[PDB]
Amino acid sequence: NPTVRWRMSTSWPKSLDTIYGSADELCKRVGQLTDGKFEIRAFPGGELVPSAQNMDAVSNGTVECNHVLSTMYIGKNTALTFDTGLSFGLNARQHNAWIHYGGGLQQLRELYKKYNIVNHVCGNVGVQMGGWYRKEIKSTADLNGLNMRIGGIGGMVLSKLGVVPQQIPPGDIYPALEKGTIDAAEWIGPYDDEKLGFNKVAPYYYSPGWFEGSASITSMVNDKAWEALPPAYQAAFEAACGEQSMRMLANYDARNPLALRKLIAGGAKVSFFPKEVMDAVYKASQQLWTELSEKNPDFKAIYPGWKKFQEDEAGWFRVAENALDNYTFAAVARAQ
């Protein structure tokens, strides 16, 4: 097999040894699998192109691949939200099940042909936190008029409640929050959020980030770059992505607990969103799916099967996984 050299434009700061670290691991593994012959170099967000351009830069061949949240690019097609995740959507396990064994990947591949891309799921961050605020969120009144940084489809939901959302890139969130040009910000969770500093300027940390059931990460590959690879190199990339689909989330799961404990020790006020706020955003989410199905044939094509899959998945996880986890987590706490 030949020597192949690619650039991977990520959307993340190097400081995030979780999500960026996973991109680096992916590249390293592809190298190992090919004796260094398939060399992919990852670049932090903003280095090669602004992260807002990471999809376009893959479609036009500027870079061979990226490492992104696909719904940053929601302005291209709202059906991209099936790739990243829907609000109150599938959890990480259920999402990977839908993708690989429920027909999701093939439906997304068809979508991505419109953009000269071959997509691969390559990570997940799980259920996100609800973000950082300067005041208590007691009711939906506290969301009306809020200038909030939020990535993904959740912005579209929150706009219905009067939030003014923006997908400001990660490295730019803290300076805006610090300056006060945004009032609130969500990123991912305790480990990453501590790295970026939001707790220094915002006292309240809410949970859960309903914004996605899980935030799944995608590597978009230029379709001509993909085609040019020999079969073993395609397999290397696929397997490395499948592996990071476990490993990235495993790193978050390992690292987040201590980070939260430290955030609380340092003064963060951690609270659940009130039930009434949860109900309001849930209802707004359901209204959004009705709208997107009516307006976007690509969303309409995927939604019904996706919805049936969620219904089946949720029913089963409620019976077994969650029956056990809810019991065990409480028993472990009592025993502590």
Added chain:
Amino acid sequence: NPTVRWRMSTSWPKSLDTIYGSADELCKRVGQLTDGKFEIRAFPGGELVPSAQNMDAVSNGTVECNHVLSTMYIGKNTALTFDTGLSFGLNARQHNAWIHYGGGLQQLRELYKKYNIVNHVCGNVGVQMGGWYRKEIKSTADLNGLNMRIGGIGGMVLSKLGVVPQQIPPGDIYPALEKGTIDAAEWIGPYDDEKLGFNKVAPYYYSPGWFEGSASITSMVNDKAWEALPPAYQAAFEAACGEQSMRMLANYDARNPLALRKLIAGGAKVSFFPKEVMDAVYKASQQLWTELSEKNPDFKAIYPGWKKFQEDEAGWFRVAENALDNYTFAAVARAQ
């Protein structure tokens, strides 16, 4: 003309097709990664050696690797329980986090090296069910004298409450339930149980299966066979295992819900173990760990750190992950 040729002795009949199929996928991916030059052939349980001998067969070099449930070999060393999962143990995500980012893999590698093995995690079954019961379980009194097909660690815990674990060939479980020779049987979960029709002869299908936690699947590799591989072939095996750690579970997550629907349509009564029963089996499990730790320094050395990891994980998952999943699963049910 392969460069390396290995045999993989699995513990499964091909009819356990989610698990055996994953072993096949693993071997196929390794072939893809190496243009067929690292050839691994999988074999069903018993074809090369009995499944009970799969660990020793690898230790002795009879075969290069296996595909097994490590708790089958707890008679050799009870610390192997940490590889597969403890009763009321980690969930699948938490186990993979412990293994890859929490120090678990290194602790298990040190244990396995003494048996001439390099171990890799390569799958997870997810939470299984509590089994098929002819009669309702209302309290721990109903466990005393219960003749239940169950083994391993679950049997050891339940025996403390007066259950009499039963050993019976797989094809004899259905007729044994039909005749009332046994009162109850655990097999696996909906996908596999559906093929055997236990619902037709023992309608109460109890949840959750706490017995095995979220059982992880291991490939034990002979250490000299492992060391003899070219590094790209080591990486191929590692990556294929990391990938199957996601894919096997994804396939069970996709498959189990349809099977559960079929079981319910055949008369399965999904039932939940009462709180009093759950508390009693949790307590009995903790007594077992105390005893295993007192008897085996290898178990004692791992347990406290594993327990702390579980406490840390449970504390964090309660904040966001389970907060959202519990909300969503309930909402999805209402909308359906």
